[PDB]
């Protein structure tokens, strides 16, 4: 929907997980 | 998964688990890419070298879970297969090639804290996004090396620069492919396995926060073997098949 | 298997 690929649990609340800032981290 | 970690509620409510009826077992990973689609691997339907060729009434989709085994009471929600969609182009006869299906479910899932639809890239996304080196996150129930984990495990894996994918293997690889893990040298290592088949490999965009599908769990020689990579479905290369799909048959 | 059952319903 308009709201894909975000999460109820994170995004939503602006809670990140454990280990996503490994990907941002690699988006060089 | 092998080397991965247990998931954390919520992380990936986009996951879904294909289960077989009879008898009542896990079958593959997937995705839900809206309240009535839910996209996967061709080869967890259809893959006429091992007899198999499931039908829709042989299968259930279950979506919002975290334990592999228990039925998730007031979470997880299972649905009915409608009509499955197989590119017509998977080439189940030499090298997985187009290795993607669609499933409709018979009616739509409800949206919760522990289901939510997952997007699919487009162009810009993809190009952006599906560099060597950069990291993708791969999910699923699947074997823990070469036991089954209690629940959903999770993974993060660097793209892996075309040449050395094709050099990895004897398999011809193709542009519908990419593969993802670490070299021998990135002392890291991690995989999907057998069991993880059909689930998504996500990256969360730097430009909008938003979690994209690039991937579907596809194939690989062993798992997490040195100099062996994972091979996936390439997610923006079909896109065209996928629309059309969805468009047509709703 | 080692799966806990699925409500009737569903099947
Ligand atoms: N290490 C991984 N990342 C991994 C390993 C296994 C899978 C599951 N996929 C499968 O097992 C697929 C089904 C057809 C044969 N197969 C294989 O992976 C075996 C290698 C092969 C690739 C392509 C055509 C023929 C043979 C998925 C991922
Ligand atoms: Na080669
Ligand atoms: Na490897």
Not at chain 2, 60 to 71: A, C, D, E, N, W
Not at chain 2, 174 to 202: H, I, L, Q, W
């Given at each position: 929907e308009a709201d894909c690929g975000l999460r109820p649990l994170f995004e939503k609340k602006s809670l990140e997980d454990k280990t996503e800032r490994e990907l941002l981290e690699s988006y060089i | 998964?092998?080397?991965?970690?247990?998931?954390?509620?919520?992380?990936?409510?986009?996951?879904?688990?294909?289960?077989?009826?009879?008898?009542?077992?896990?079958?593959?990973?997937?995705?839900?890419?809206?309240?009535?689609?839910?996209?996967?691997?061709?080869?967890?339907?259809?893959?006429?070298?091992?007899?198999?060729?499931?039908?829709?009434?042989?299968?259930?989709?279950?979506?919002?879970?975290?334990?592999?085994?228990?039925?998730?009471?007031?979470?997880?929600?299972?649905?009915?297969?409608?009509?499955?969609?197989?590119?017509?182009?998977?080439?189940?006869?030499?090298?997985?090639?187009?290795?993607?299906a669609l499933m409709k479910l018979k009616k739509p899932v409800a949206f919760s804290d522990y289901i939510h639809p997952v997007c699919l890239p487009d162009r810009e996304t993809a190009a952006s996004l599906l560099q060597a080196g950069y990291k993708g996150r791969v999910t699923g129930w699947g074997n823990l090396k070469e036991g089954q984990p209690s629940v959903l495990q999770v993974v993060?894996?660097?793209?892996?620069?075309?040449?050395?994918?094709?050099?990895?293997?004897?398999?011809?690889?193709?542009?519908?492919?990419?593969?993802?893990?670490?070299?021998?040298?990135?002392?890291?290592?991690?995989?999907?396995?057998?069991?993880?088949?059909?689930?998504?490999?996500?990256?969360?965009?730097?430009?909008?926060?938003?979690?994209?599908?690039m991937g579907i769990v596809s194939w690989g020689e062993g798992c997490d073997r040195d100099g062996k990579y994972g091979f996936y479905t390439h997610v923006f290369r079909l896109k065209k098949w996928i629309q059309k799909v969805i468009d047509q048959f709703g | 298997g080692d799966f806990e059952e699925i409500p009737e319903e569903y099947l």
């Open positions: - | 998964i092998v080397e991965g970690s247990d998931a954390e509620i919520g992380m990936s409510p986009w996951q879904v688990m294909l289960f077989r009826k009879s008898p009542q077992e896990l079958l593959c990973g997937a995705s839900l890419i809206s309240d009535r689609w839910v996209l996967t691997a061709a080869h967890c339907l259809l893959y006429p070298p091992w007899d198999k060729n499931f039908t829709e009434n042989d299968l259930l989709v279950r979506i919002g879970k975290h334990s592999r085994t228990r039925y998730e009471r007031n979470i997880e929600k299972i649905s009915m297969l409608e009509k499955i969609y197989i590119h017509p182009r998977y080439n189940w006869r030499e090298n997985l090639d187009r290795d993607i993060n894996l660097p793209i892996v620069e075309r040449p050395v994918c094709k050099d990895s293997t004897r398999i011809r690889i193709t542009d519908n492919m990419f593969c993802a893990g670490y070299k021998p040298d990135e002392g890291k290592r991690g995989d999907a396995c057998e069991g993880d088949s059909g689930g998504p490999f996500v990256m969360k965009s730097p430009f909008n926060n938003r979690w994209y599908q | -």
